[PDB]
Amino acid sequence: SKEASALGVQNIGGIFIVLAAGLVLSVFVAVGEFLYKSKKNAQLEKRSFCSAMVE
Amino acid sequence: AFLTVERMESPIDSADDLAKQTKIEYGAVEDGATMTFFKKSKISTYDKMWA
């Protein structure tokens, strides 16, 4: 009769890692979709789209 | 789970409530004829508590 436990990092911590992975994969797919719309507009090389980035 | 374990306990603390719950600990003047009454006993509760 000893099992009254608060929850701790040891047993749940992995979802912080899940946050990390989801965040980074979103980063990559987002930059990919940037290139997607970019090439949809013009040829491969973009400078005016950097201007849209700055503005 | 917290409220579960908290509600598990019983406060009557009879001859048996001590037997089941094991957070608190027993005491007896060993060889003082009370511990002998436990060890000699055939009472299931007293038997297991003597054990």
Side-chain angles (χ1 to χ4, degrees):
Chain A
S1 192
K2 300 294 187 291
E3 314 89 320
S5 301
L7 265 174
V9 59
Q10 203 265 349
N11 297 115
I12 75 162
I15 295 92
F16 200 116
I17 294 94
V18 182
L19 181 163
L23 190 153
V24 299
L25 62 83
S26 62
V27 169
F28 293 101
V29 66
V31 75
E33 201 73 5
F34 176 75
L35 188 152
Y36 175 41
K37 187 263 287 181
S38 315
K39 70 149 283 187
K40 284 192 314 197
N41 192 3
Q43 185 60 256
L44 306 180
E45 265 314 309
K46 323 299 201 298
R47 275 70 173 174
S48 69
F49 302 163
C50 176
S51 83
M53 183 177 176
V54 171
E55 73 191 0
Chain B
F2 276 89
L3 273 69
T4 316
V5 298
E6 74 82 18
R7 194 166 161 78
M8 295 298 102
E9 294 302 330
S10 65
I12 297 169
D13 292 19
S14 178
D16 292 331
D17 312 335
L18 261 68
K20 333 296 160 164
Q21 171 265 341
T22 53
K23 296 177 68 68
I24 73 185
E25 300 315 310
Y26 300 98
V29 64
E30 68 263 16
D31 294 330
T34 58
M35 202 45 188
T36 77
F37 160 77
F38 264 95
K39 70 197 211 316
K40 79 175 268 194
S41 61
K42 53 187 168 293
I43 299 90
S44 54
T45 77
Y46 308 165
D47 285 332
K48 55 168 163 281
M49 295 299 102
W50 150 241

